[PDB]
Structures are given as structure tokens and as C-alpha cells.
Amino acid sequence: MFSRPGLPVEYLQVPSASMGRDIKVQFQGGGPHAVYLLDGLRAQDDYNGWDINTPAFEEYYQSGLSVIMPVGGQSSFYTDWYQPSQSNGQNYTYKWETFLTREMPAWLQANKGVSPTGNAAVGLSMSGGSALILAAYYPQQFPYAASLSGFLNPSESWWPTLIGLAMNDSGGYNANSMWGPSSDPAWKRNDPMVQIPRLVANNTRIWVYCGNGTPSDLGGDNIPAKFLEGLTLRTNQTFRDTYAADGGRNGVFNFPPNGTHSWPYWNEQLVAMKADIQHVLNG
């Protein structure tokens, strides 16, 4: 982990009444407002990917912002599922939106003094869209959201299938148990592209990054993974175009040709957005 000695990183056990279990949370206090760092598709139950692969905590130490790294939620898309993943034996239903928007913030407010409002949600790949959705539906809690190499049009064309494939490949989770068949409204409800009107209306400050190239931490190798990576960039470009078309004016769109879908670049983006977050959240 990059949470080396000196950094006041705590490991909290936060009860989730909705999921009937305790959720581990890596936390670094540094102010009433916090940056929620969401993990990727293969989120582990011991440490958040951000701490494993980047010096995120150190980079935000003394930034005037607390850093919250929830642990776990493999292939959960940080959303509330319809039912336990049907196939891999999950014995409970993922309710990560409920955890992130109600249970965890309530806990941190009562015990740490972290404000449940005026925070930033930052996600990458799997959680890229999650961050924008959290901000779309919970503007008070998240006036700021960043998506790094996110899947921003999950309900469109190949996306439901690609997402289902990724989830199955990551812990054997079932996308159908999450948002039902692709025709289910849950897919559009959790589609950043479809929810752009919300982001515009709430004047959400959005930071959207997308690299390009394969292989990467996004995947790569074979033709299917290559298609996914290519679709990811194109969809991010369409998201930017649609956001603009819909009246959006508070976004930062970073599409550097040499940017990659990797922790080094996602970390670079996290650092680059620090000043932006500080100004928006503590300005």
C-alpha cells in the first residue's frame, strides 16, 4: 500500500444495515469535506485499489480534504442491486448506493464530523459512471464528480453486454441481478449519458478523463477487450459532445492522446484535479 507510515490512515468497520454486513473503509481525516475514491471492477476486500496502486492518501494529505476509500464491492458498480447476484452464491444484495449516500456518510458525520454534503465522488473504469450517477442523483452530497475511463452510456448498444461480460469475469457477478435485463429502466436510470440533464441542471462540476490504447488496466489483449477499450473512448467523446449539446458548462474534459487506462495516469488525473476540487469544495 502507498499509505506508508506518517499518513493518519484509519481502517474503519462501518455497518451497512441494507447489506447486513460491516463495510471496511480506509479513511484519512483532513477536513469536513471529503473525496470519495471509488474502486475499479475488481475491487478487493482488503484494500481499495487507489491505496494499492497510488499515493492518493499522501497526495491529498493536508489538502484540506478528507479522503474516503470504501473497501470491497467487486463488480458492484456501486449501485443498489435488485437481488443477490444469481450465479456466484452471493448471499445478500449489494446496496452500495444506499451505503455511499446514507449509511457511510451518516457514520462519518456522527463519528468524525465529516459533512454528508459538499463532497466529491471520484471513480475510474467501473466506478467512473458510478461517480457521475452519484452526483446526478445526490447533487447536495456530490457537487463534484470525476470519471476516469468510465463507461458513460451503460444502457446503449453493446454496453449492457460488455458490462455483463466484465462483471462475470470479475467474481462471476450477474449484471441481470444488478439492473435486470437491458430493457429494464434501471439501465437508463444509471446511465450517465441519459442522466446528463441532471448533471447540467445541478451544475455539477465534472472532471472527465479517458485514455486510449491496449492493453491496459482496463483490459486490452483480444478483440473483445480491444473493442471495449475503443468503445470506452468513443462513448466518453460522445458524452462530452452530449453534455455540451445539453447545455453543460462546468466540465473539464481530458482526452490526452498519450493518456492510458492505467493507475499511473488515473493517479495523475487525481492529482491534477486536486486544485479543482479544493476550489469547488472549499473555495
CATH of 1-283, one of 3.40.50.300, 1.10.3720.10, 3.40.50.1820, 1.10.540.10: 3.40.50.1820
Nearest C-alpha neighbor of 262 from the set 224, 199, 212, 204: 212
- No. of H helices and E strands in the chain? 11, 8
Q: Helix, strand, or coil here: 74?
A: coil
User: How were these coordinates obtained?
Assistant: X-ray
The full DSSP string for 207-253 is EEE----SSSSS--SSHHHHHHHHHHHHHHHHHHHHHHHTT--SEEE
Binding-site members are: 41-42, 125, 153, 231-234, 238, 261-263
Q: What is the resolution of this structure in A?
A: 1.8
**Sequence ranges of the domains in the chain:** 1-283
What count of Cα atoms within 13 Å lies in the side-chain half-sphere of residue 185? 0
Nearest C-alpha neighbor of 67 from the set 76, 75, 79, 59: 59
Q: Helix, strand, or coil here: 254?
A: strand
C-alpha to C-alpha distances, 25 to 10, 52, 232, nearest whole angstrom: 8, 14, 29
∠ Cα 265 268 269 (to 5°): 90
Quote the longest CA-to-CA distance of the chain. 50
Going 49 to 53 to 58 to 64, the CA torsion angle's sign is negative
Pairing of strands 34-37, 66-70: parallel
Binding-site members for substrate are: 41-42, 125, 153, 231-234, 238, 261-263
Q: What 8-state DSSP symbol labels residue 150? A: -
Catalytic residue list: 125, 229, 261
